[PDB]
Amino acid sequence: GLTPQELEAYGISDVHDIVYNPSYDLLYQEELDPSLTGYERGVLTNLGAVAVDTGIFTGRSPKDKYIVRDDTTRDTFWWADKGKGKNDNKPLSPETWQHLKGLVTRQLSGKRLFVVDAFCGANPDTRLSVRFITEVAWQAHFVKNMFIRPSDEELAGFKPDFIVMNGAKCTNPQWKEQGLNSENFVAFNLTERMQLIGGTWYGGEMKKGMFSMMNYLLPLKGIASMHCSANVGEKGDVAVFFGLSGTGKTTLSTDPKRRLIGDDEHGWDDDGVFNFEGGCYAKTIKLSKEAEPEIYNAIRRDALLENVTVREDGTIDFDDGSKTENTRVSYPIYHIDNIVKPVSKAGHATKVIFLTADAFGVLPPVSRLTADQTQYHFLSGFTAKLAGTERGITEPTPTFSACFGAAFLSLHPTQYAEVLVKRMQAAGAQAYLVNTGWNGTGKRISIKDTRAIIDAILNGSLDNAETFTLPMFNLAIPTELPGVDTKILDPRNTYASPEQWQEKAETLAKLFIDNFDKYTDTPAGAALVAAGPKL
């Protein structure tokens, strides 16, 4: 379905063997080819799923992310070097881009190539048509899992909006003199409409780039673009769960009392909430069949395990984090029985949950937010980066991740906030802040407790429930909650010395205030200070 000549327009030469739109059967056979070496190699596990390793590239490389600054992006992108707020959108010259493109296209030239055409976005009117090019079968499999798989009729008329070229096997020897961070690179050019991957083998780089592109295009036309999971109740009530990976959004999304819309990347337009993806890239550290049965049962042929420990007998030790704590599996979304079909989308969200993995043990397990607190805490995005999720993170690392996805934002945080608020206001949606981090003793808040809290949110039992107010943060906390120990609802109770909550809360309050200061350069942002913590 694709000629060698078509690839030459992208700069790739000397290609005569193209594997276009590979089937899952073909990918499975290719991945088990014993002639593969190094990070190409795959092994078959007892669950029937192939497993691969990615070396040291066990999470994302934000410090290697670059966007060409040109007439397309100059005045619209949220640049790393132009604002008060830190971000990863580092500018790249057109000249250095051409160098990186040459490295990747030379690497892929003369090779047998896999080409996967797919969609990012469940809706035809706003989706991107993406063409992915790799020399490694498992990388093609990853994108087959993670993007929306077109029908034959859709492939017949396929016209790519973006090209993603995976050249993980190449590196940039000139990186030092070019002022770059390392010999690796994840580079984007919105004029040529291309993403390049060099050096890094982490699968997620192949999906979060297009997420960043959706995060550029959709809010500019009034559509929220959200780093969240999403599910729907029997009556059509949709919930979205914002958070960084490792902080509960995947686990809570597969709630057996709900039906899954998606894991990680969603839009919200006039019709409702829609998944961008065709699959889920779930963390597997400490996964168990008893605790996460839907996710566990999705691990079978056509799933792709990444960096998990496989024993000599082919069984998997999901508890082993010695390669990395950020072990992963990808699977097409239909590997979960309990999903929305025929398209991964539903109506407006009625419930908006912000997951905060609070390493200070200050915040309540659950708070019901006011309208202004919703905006304040969305822009703040206080949570934690968990080990391995970005390279060099070795332990839970507190962060203010604007919009609960700062690493993927292409526009200013307030642009995401304004669209989200407009959608929530139109729906009458209620927001909740849920601590999936740690309590006052340093113990991780139990998934059993968080699941019970989510249950109480989603059945509406908290919307008009009696509350008490937490000092300084001014958060409304329910006085009791079915299926949860009342004593945990007040975060002060789990401290051996409750005066220490006061000390840690003052410290965290100041961190929030200082982080939020940069948003107070407009009247609306200044007005939100009253909804944040007060010393």
Hunting for tokens 């905060």 — which residue is that? 356
- Name 436's Cβ contacts closer than 8 Å, sequence gap at least 6: 243, 247, 248, 355, 356, 357, 445, 450
**Cβ proximity of 401 and 358 under 8 Å:** no
One of 69, 207, 227, 345 is an active-site residue; which one? 227
For residues 153 and 136, give the distance between their C-alpha atoms in angstroms, rounded to a whole number: 26
The number of angstroms, rounded, from the C-alpha of 508 to the middle of its chain's C-alpha atoms is 25
Closest CA to 362 of 489, 512, 473, 505: 505
In the listed set 179, 201, 222, which residue is the last one of a domain according to the structure?
222
> The domain spanning residue 409 has which CATH number?
3.90.228.20
Binding-site residues, in ranges, read: 60, 144-145, 147, 202, 208, 227, 243-251, 264, 278, 292, 328, 444-445, 450
What does each C-alpha distance from 321 to 52, 54, 98, 142, 532 come to in angstroms? 15, 14, 38, 22, 37
Half-sphere exposure of 16 (CA within 13 A, CB side): 1
The number of angstroms, rounded, from the C-alpha of 251 to the middle of its chain's C-alpha atoms is 13
Establish whether 335 is a catalytic residue. Answer: no
According to DSSP H, which parts of 109-190 are helical?
137-146, 152-156
Closest CA to 269 of 210, 219, 342: 219
Same structural domain, 331 and 456: no
Same structural domain, 139 and 273: no
Same structural domain, 48 and 73: no
Establish whether 317 is a catalytic residue. Answer: no
Binding-site residues for substrate, in ranges, read: 60, 202, 208, 328
Closest CA to 267 of 147, 127, 162, 404: 127
Establish whether 264 is a catalytic residue. Answer: yes
Same structural domain, 286 and 421: no
In the listed set 183, 201, 222, which residue is the last one of a domain according to the structure?
222
For residues 31 and 52, give the distance between their C-alpha atoms in angstroms, rounded to a whole number: 9
Same structural domain, 289 and 312: yes
In the listed set 336, 357, 384, which residue is the last one of a domain according to the structure?
336
Supply the range of the domain harboring residue 48. 38-58+279-336
For residues 240 and 346, give the distance between their C-alpha atoms in angstroms, rounded to a whole number: 11
Strand partners, 108: none
Establish whether 60 is a catalytic residue. Answer: yes
According to DSSP H, which parts of 121-221 are helical?
137-146, 152-156, 205-217
Token readout for 290 is 């008893």
For residues 224 and 410, give the distance between their C-alpha atoms in angstroms, rounded to a whole number: 13
What does each C-alpha distance from 374 to 184, 378, 420, 485, 531 come to in angstroms? 38, 6, 10, 26, 9
- Name 404's Cβ contacts closer than 8 Å, sequence gap at least 6: 227, 228, 242, 243, 244, 354, 355, 378, 381, 383
**Cβ proximity of 373 and 380 under 8 Å:** no
Hunting for tokens 């902080």 — which residue is that? 247
For residues 417 and 347, give the distance between their C-alpha atoms in angstroms, rounded to a whole number: 20
> The domain spanning residue 98 has which CATH number?
3.40.449.10
E-strand spans in 358-472?
Answer: 366-368, 382-385, 397-400, 430-435, 467-470
Same structural domain, 74 and 163: yes
Binding-site residues for ATP, in ranges, read: 208, 227, 243-251, 292, 328, 444-445, 450
- Name 270's Cβ contacts closer than 8 Å, sequence gap at least 6: none
For residues 374 and 278, give the distance between their C-alpha atoms in angstroms, rounded to a whole number: 29
> The domain spanning residue 48 has which CATH number?
2.170.8.10
The number of angstroms, rounded, from the C-alpha of 444 to the middle of its chain's C-alpha atoms is 22
User: What is the bridge-based pairing of β-strands 397-400 and 382-385?
Assistant: antiparallel
Same structural domain, 13 and 109: yes
| Size of the chain in residues | 535
Establish whether 245 is a catalytic residue. Answer: yes
For residues 501 and 494, give the distance between their C-alpha atoms in angstroms, rounded to a whole number: 9
Token readout for 105 is 């296209």
CA dihedral 180, 185, 191, 193 (to 10 degrees): 180
Same structural domain, 253 and 147: no
Same structural domain, 314 and 459: no
Establish whether 441 is a catalytic residue. Answer: no
One of 328, 368, 385, 412 is an active-site residue; which one? 328
Domain count, the chain: 3
Q: What is the DSSP letter of 167?
A: E
Establish whether 330 is a catalytic residue. Answer: no
**Cβ proximity of 378 and 299 under 8 Å:** no
**Cβ proximity of 135 and 110 under 8 Å:** no
Same structural domain, 312 and 357: no
Same structural domain, 379 and 488: yes
Structure determination method: X-ray
Establish whether 328 is a catalytic residue. Answer: yes
Cα-based angle 505, 510, 513 (whole degrees, multiple of 5): 125
Same structural domain, 440 and 301: no
Full 3-state SS string of 196-230: EEECCCCCCHHHHHHHHHHHHHCHHHCCEEEEEEE
According to DSSP H, which parts of 149-204 are helical?
152-156
